Homo-oligomer: A and B are copies of this chain.
Amino acid sequence: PKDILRKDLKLVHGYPMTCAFASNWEKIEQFHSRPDDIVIATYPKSGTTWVSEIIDMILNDGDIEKCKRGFITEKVPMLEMTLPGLRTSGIEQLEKNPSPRIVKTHLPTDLLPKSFWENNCKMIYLARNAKDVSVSYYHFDLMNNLQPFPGTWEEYLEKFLTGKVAYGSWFTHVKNWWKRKEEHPILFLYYEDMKENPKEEIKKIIRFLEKNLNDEILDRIIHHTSFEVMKDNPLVNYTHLPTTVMDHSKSPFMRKGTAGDWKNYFTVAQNEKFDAIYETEMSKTALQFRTEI
């Protein structure tokens, strides 16, 4: 463990990558998908864990005890995750998992195993406004010891803006995933929409996944996957991980679960600078993020 903890990011295909995840990349590259695999793809801290539980519920017809068959890391493995000696890798877990497999990933489009495009796999891409992500990712690096130490918020926001963070730039991640939406079966969702109206957003996932679930099951999914519920659910709140991987005393994994929390952290000067870069990166795209609800 001493060799992966708090280490510098390594570049893999031009992307800064968590040191623990950066070895044997050949295995990821060559991963074999099944045509009924369902990918949930997000930039980090964008609501992956939230929507993994929603999807597991949908696929289990809202049966909560089925959703309690294991920890989230077993039900919905992160494809690119490795912590050898400490944990089954994501791909090792996935090769033991029954179809249809839910696969979580934060990979950029050009790093996703091509098998997933080739098997025409259904994908849910979820995105969250860049300001809330930077704040959530900052606190994440406080508690997750696989990450480099983030420094001060001021130092961290500058790395985030220039893409000097694990998985690289949020702008490029979001823009390149959005572009793929035209030639693949990808449902593109916003975190803020899920926060404001989970029923209508969950219905989009239900239709995308070719399921019909009645209003009682839907209400149960909404209730089971609410922040207050999930935060106390020990199968999903990440307290099952070794303290050497995640120390929740520094920041809880389930932290605030809100839109607009970034305003508690951004100075007005940081905000002006951030808005200027954002307009440069995003004005020409059809993406329309909300930074509060």
Give A contacts to B, CB under 8 Å.
182, 185, 190, 193, 199-200, 203-204, 206-207, 211-216, 218, 279, 282-286, 288, 290
**Which residues does chain B contribute within 8 Å of A215, judged by CB atoms?**
279, 282-284
Residue from B207, B279, B283, B290 within 8 A of A193 (CB atoms): B207
Q: Specify which chain B residues have a CB less than 8 angstroms from the CB of A204 in the assembled complex.
A: 290
Q: Is the CB of B203 within 8 A of A288?
A: yes
User: Are A213 and B286 in contact (CB-based, < 8 A)?
Assistant: yes
Some 25 contacts from A to B, beta carbons below 8 A apart, are A182-B199, A185-B200, A190-B207, A193-B207, A200-B290, A203-B288, A203-B290, A204-B290, A206-B288, A207-B288, A211-B286, A212-B286, A213-B286, A213-B288, A214-B283, A214-B284, A214-B285, A214-B286, A215-B279, A215-B282, A215-B283, A215-B284, A216-B283, A216-B284, A218-B288
- Min C-beta distance of A200 to chain B, whole Å: 6
Nearest 7 Cβ contacts at the A-B interface: A212-B286, A215-B283, A203-B288, A214-B286, A214-B284, A185-B200, A213-B286
Looking across the interface, which residue of chain B has its beta carbon closest to that of A291? B200
Residues of B within 8 A of A218 (CB): 288
Least CB separation from A285: chain B residue:
B214
A213-B286, A215-B282 known; 17 new pairs, CB 8 Å cut-off, are A182-B199, A185-B200, A190-B207, A193-B207, A203-B290, A207-B288, A211-B286, A212-B286, A213-B288, A214-B283, A214-B284, A214-B285, A214-B286, A215-B283, A215-B284, A216-B283, A216-B284
Contacts of A206 in B (CB 8 A): 288
CA distance A190 to B185 in the complex (A): 16
